Amino acid sequence: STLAENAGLNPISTVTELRNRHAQGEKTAGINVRKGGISNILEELVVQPLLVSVSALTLATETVRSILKIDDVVNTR
Amino acid sequence: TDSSQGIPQLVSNISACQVIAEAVRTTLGPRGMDKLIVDGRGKATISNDGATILKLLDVVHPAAKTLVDIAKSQDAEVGDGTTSVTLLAAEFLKQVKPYVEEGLHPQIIIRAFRTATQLAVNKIKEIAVTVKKADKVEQRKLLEKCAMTALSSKLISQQKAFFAKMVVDAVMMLDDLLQLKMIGIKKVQGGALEDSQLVAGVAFKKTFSYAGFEMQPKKYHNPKIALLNVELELKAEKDNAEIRVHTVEDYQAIVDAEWNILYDKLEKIHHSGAKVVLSKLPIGDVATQYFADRDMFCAGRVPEEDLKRTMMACGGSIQTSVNALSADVLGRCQVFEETQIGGERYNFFTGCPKAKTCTFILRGGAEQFMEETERSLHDAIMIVRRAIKNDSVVAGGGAIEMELSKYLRDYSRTIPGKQQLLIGAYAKALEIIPRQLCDNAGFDATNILNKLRARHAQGGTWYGVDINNEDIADNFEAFVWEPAMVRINALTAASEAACLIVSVDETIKNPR
Amino acid sequence: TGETIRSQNVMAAASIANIVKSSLGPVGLDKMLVDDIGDVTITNDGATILKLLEVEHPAAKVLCELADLQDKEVGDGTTSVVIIAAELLKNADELVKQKIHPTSVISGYRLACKEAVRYINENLIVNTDELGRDCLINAAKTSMSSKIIGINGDFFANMVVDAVLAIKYTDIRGQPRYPVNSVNILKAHGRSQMESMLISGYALNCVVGSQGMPKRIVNAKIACLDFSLQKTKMKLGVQVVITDPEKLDQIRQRESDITKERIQKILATGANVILTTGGIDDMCLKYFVEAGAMAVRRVLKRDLKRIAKASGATILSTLANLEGEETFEAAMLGQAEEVVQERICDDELILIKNTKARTSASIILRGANDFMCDEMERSLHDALCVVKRVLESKSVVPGGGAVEAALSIYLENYATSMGSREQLAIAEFARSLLVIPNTLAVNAAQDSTDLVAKLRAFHNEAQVNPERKNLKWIGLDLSNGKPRDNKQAGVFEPTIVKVKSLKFATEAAITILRIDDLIKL
Ligand SMILES: Nc1ncnc2c1ncn2[C@@H]1O[C@H](COP(=O)(O)OP(=O)(O)O)[C@@H](O)[C@H]1O
């Protein structure tokens, strides 16, 4: 949604179209920036490792659990 | 305690007109928003028409008063084009506002506006195409295409469209006006076996039944409606008045003295020929028995609209006397039938010598379907009347303003004077119809105006706008048109209103 | 936040741009600047105002920095860029407020600028001279302010065009260089203004107080000397350590006996007259007058520098100090052809005929006001600048404000033919181009609403009916509010300057529009 908003198109409609395409043909396309439409990623030479997402998600979940488990009162000196 | 003359007065007038312009704006398209209006009494009403809202609102401003007066005059003289003229005037004022504070005399823009209006009128007259009995062989194909265009505005059933076409074609005899405000329409309540029925005559509503109501004949050979304002109820007549109470013989004496005059009056009013009594007040208990004993007809509880329709169809005369009547101010019918359907008793007055009104019964057996789905048939019959009466026609929608704006913009590039910017602003201000039509439907007008301008840059056809499919299609093939005479009058009225607004420079007040 | 700081930056840019607005063109009022001390400076130059002005806004600071960076490499065109950027910002503010992504209008502005550059690059002039520099009757009257004399301006224009076309220069071995610029002048008083002559070879300073040279024969070449011999000390070269109270009376005779061989070697081949500055004695001249060798006095540093930079005969290669016992080479010898002192303007000046390398013309003024030295000098400077800027680069455009209308019309046509999301941006860019003719008409005390309308109506005919591309390009006038053809008598301007100015303005507008918030994050 943030990418579609920064590109200059309708974010809700693009998100709904992407969800429909994912529910229909599983792996279809994504969001393009250079052309400004919905094109397949297999033509554009752009990839990223899986660690940059797995480690990020694990760190975010750990931080959320740490900030949720901390409560009570915050005493000071 | 402060007042000016010139630029501040015009600015104040524009600001006052903008209020009444923004007050009514969303009610323009076919699916506009509703508005609830209530006064100091305590009763509220929901309406969506611009004329009803403008009629139930008063402004203490001279410019707004003149504007609403011009709008009311245009709506009364024509019948279509009340909010569009106001929006055009508001856009013209908004475009002329920045070209006033820069030190410009408004006496030089009136000529430019008049020339632009004349050029637009000439272009519309030279671009309008009329067709009326010149092709499509016999008129059967013409009426078939007319019915198809009538049913193309709203997606309804085929039988309903056929019944609407029949009820709109079976009423074209002596009607020579340009509006359906003569015969009118009336929505009934209840249910039946079929979906819709048609009949020629005056209809009626629910009638209260009593004991022995089947004594009157159901079919009449030559009935005559008794047009008498007096009624025969227990409250009207009397059997005992101011008399000395002693025994029972005085009661019989006074009741006979009253019944003598009653019988004289009834035989005098029945000897003229009238036998179908249509009393306004409901009947009692002994009046029905007295009417059935004399082999006559009785009724009660009838509205004024039904009486007016009966007087207009059967040709009755207004009688302002009870007794001493003649046999020339009475009505004459032919066939009077009483048929009960469901949980009500319906009446049929078929055989009127003056074929004027016709009943179009629309009962499906529900309580919400009667009130709803009532504007579609009205729009269909209005389009049918406009296509039958008027000769000139053009493609409707937002396909006639863009071409005029492009023509004005192309013509403004061949004048070496101060009128160039004036004509440019006049052409730019003409784009307010399709943008508002797209904004009222919850769409994106920015994605459609660019496509319309790209298509009208070199095509010049009848490509308008869509609502259902949300795209750009040809309005000439969508079976939607509009007369080429209302737009000219609306533009002329808007130009006259703009000139009258820009001509006022200041006001003069007087205490005493 | 968001849409507020952007409006504030736009307002600040408009306020800082509405200061040098009433100072564009040659007709403008003056501006006073105070340094918050007590002194006041009156100037009407846009560059001097933009350079001497306090700033405190980041957007204004970066705008001034970009303007300075543009002015460091481009001569003129540093004032209209700020107005163009302000107009672009005030036109894009409404687009942003109308719920439009700034990337769309940025791409539209980029496409409009590219289309304008492509259309400009296809409208140039191949010829560099038309019947002798615009018929040599129109290219000199517009570049010369005639307020006291104008009846006999044809002769002055002919003299100017002759002086600028008869002499050329070439040194880069790739393109013809500009001719002479620092020509010699002679201000006279009480002369016939209705008569003027042109002679070849510039003259030096007037010899006053030492005109005892019987010039009767025609010489060949001459020489030059920077220092001067003297008994006692006076200039640089005399030693201060040698203490001799009796040798000072015989140092002149010793120096003469030493330089006798040098003078004898100079007298060979063809060299007689030498050039010596002030500080020489008359006894040496009286002793050398019997052999044929003399010396012309009244020599300054400017004349020596001009001689060294003209013919190329340098002296530093061999001589440097007072030691005159150096080698004898042809570097310190003025190889000329004829040096005669004719009778001109009732005077006897050094006249060098047939000068090598360069050949300058002696421009002698007439008896009038002292301002005549500032009347033809500016015209000659403009002429040499034109012939040096349009020579190596044939990218010139006619007029000054007659090209924005056609560009705006072409941009509007392209926006109408496009029909995409970047449609209103090109229209706004085309509308934001009529700010220079309007300002020029306002500063000239004329009606801009009628002038711009007439200019657009005249320019639309050249694009509707394709008939020609060189004619039908009329523009505005400075004398009165009447359209005049800027081809037969107009002044051309370099197109590269305008292209760079437009590119810098577009870059500044894009940079300002790309700035979101200014909060300390
Ligand atoms: N004879 C003329 N006719 C029409 N316009 C002229 C004439 N002389 C000068 N101008 C205009 O005056 C302007 C002077 O701009 P200038 O002050 O040099 O800008 P900057 O200060 O940025 O260098 C030029 O843009 C030119 O178009």
Tab-separated table of C-alpha atoms in Angstrom, chain A residues 2 4-5 18 24-25 27 30 34 36-37 39-40 42 47 49 51 56 58 63-64 66-68:
chain	number	residue	atom	x	y	z
A	2	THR	CA	2.830	2.413	0.822
A	4	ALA	CA	1.362	2.149	-4.440
A	5	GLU	CA	0.794	5.453	-2.630
A	18	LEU	CA	-3.012	-8.024	-6.209
A	24	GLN	CA	-6.579	-16.810	-8.681
A	25	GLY	CA	-3.211	-17.604	-10.254
A	27	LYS	CA	2.134	-16.275	-8.237
A	30	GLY	CA	3.666	-7.272	-8.177
A	34	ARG	CA	9.973	2.283	-13.686
A	36	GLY	CA	4.347	2.514	-13.558
A	37	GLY	CA	2.009	-0.451	-13.814
A	39	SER	CA	4.205	-6.224	-14.767
A	40	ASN	CA	5.828	-9.570	-14.049
A	42	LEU	CA	10.739	-12.280	-14.032
A	47	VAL	CA	16.043	-10.071	-6.395
A	49	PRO	CA	17.946	-12.865	-0.236
A	51	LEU	CA	17.471	-13.650	5.231
A	56	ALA	CA	13.657	-8.806	10.038
A	58	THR	CA	11.997	-12.466	13.789
A	63	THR	CA	10.805	-6.547	19.892
A	64	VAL	CA	6.995	-6.645	19.969
A	66	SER	CA	9.564	-7.552	24.660
A	67	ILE	CA	7.566	-4.310	24.533
A	68	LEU	CA	4.351	-6.198	25.361
